[PDB]
């Protein structure tokens, strides 16, 4: 069973799943908007929102924390200096998911876009 | 007056395409178009082409009006099968039948 269990598995072992989220985070923070499968998208929100919320803190601790997942100093500089500030007065919800209308041809996978909020 | 199009020797298995065809038989050209566009099946691609070709035939050759066309008749026939070898364990060789479809769409005019 699965009673009151939180978190998708996405058919990956523990370290692959982590990487998946970390890589999607790098891509989202880099381009502001990416397209994925709906399940990957819905799961990315929390992972990235937390990273953004820490950038909103600003301190050295937060920077080194975010650096654990994002791993890229320049990308984190962008996070703290350009991304984080526009969410100063926003209380969570820094990302949105909207579903596309067309499925992948090769496997019928339903797609969705994930973007940072205005 | 009717207009028809046939796609012969389409490399898809009849039992599969017919599922898609069944979705559009009897429907307006417009609804049939909308259905096929969001039918998550390989067959939707093929059935759509035959539909559109038949619509073209109706307008361009048979003096029928696009805004009145409906799918009067549609069916799939079995074409010749492509026989291929599938190697199995213990030196045994099976035969895969990569099957083939003859897709037919026949359009009529919905008067009134």
């Amino acid at each position: 069973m699965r009673h009151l269990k939180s978190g998708r598995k996405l058919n990956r072992h523990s370290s692959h799943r982590l990487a998946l989220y970390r890589n999607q985070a790098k891509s989202l923070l880099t381009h502001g908007r990416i397209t994925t499968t709906v399940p990957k998208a819905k799961e990315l929100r929390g992972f990235v929102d937390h990273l953004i919320h820490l950038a909103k803190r600003g301190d050295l601790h937060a920077r080194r924390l975010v650096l654990r997942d994002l791993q890229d100093v320049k990308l984190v500089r962008k996070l703290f200096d350009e991304i984080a500030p526009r969410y100063r007065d926003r209380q969570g919800g820094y990302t949105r998911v909207l579903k596309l209308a067309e499925r992948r041809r090769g496997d019928g996978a339903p797609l969705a876009l994930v973007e940072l909020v205005e | 007056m009717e207009a028809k199009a046939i796609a012969r020797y389409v490399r898809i298995s009849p039992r599969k395409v017919r599922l898609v065809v069944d979705l559009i038989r009897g429907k307006s050209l417009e609804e049939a178009r909308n259905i096929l566009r969001y039918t998550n099946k390989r067959g939707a691609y093929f059935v759509a082409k035959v539909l559109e070709s038949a619509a073209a035939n109706a307008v361009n050759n048979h003096d029928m009006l696009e805004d009145r066309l409906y799918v009067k008749a549609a069916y799939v026939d079995e074409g010749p099968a492509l026989k291929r070898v599938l190697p199995r364990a213990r030196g045994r060789a099976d035969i895969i039948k990569k099957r083939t479809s003859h897709i037919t769409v026949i359009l009529g005019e919905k008067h009134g």
Partner: protein, 59 residues
């Protein structure tokens, strides 16, 4: 195991009876309030790019 096997050829009636549940359900579609085109609901319209009133996507 000892290799189970069909004892009798399935009749045309019985094979087709099995498939009484095999018919496809047509796609559920709704008009897009902006361009009136037909598209699945709760998806961004692939024709004009609008959803929830605003332009979201370049078509």
């Amino acid at each position: 195991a000892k290799h189970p096997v069909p004892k009798k050829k399935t009749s045309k009636a019985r094979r087709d009876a099995r498939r009484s549940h095999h018919a496809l359900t047509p796609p559920t579609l709704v008009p897009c309030p902006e361009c009136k085109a037909m598209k699945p609901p709760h998806t961004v319209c692939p024709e004009c790019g609008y959803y929830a009133g605003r332009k979201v996507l370049e078509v």
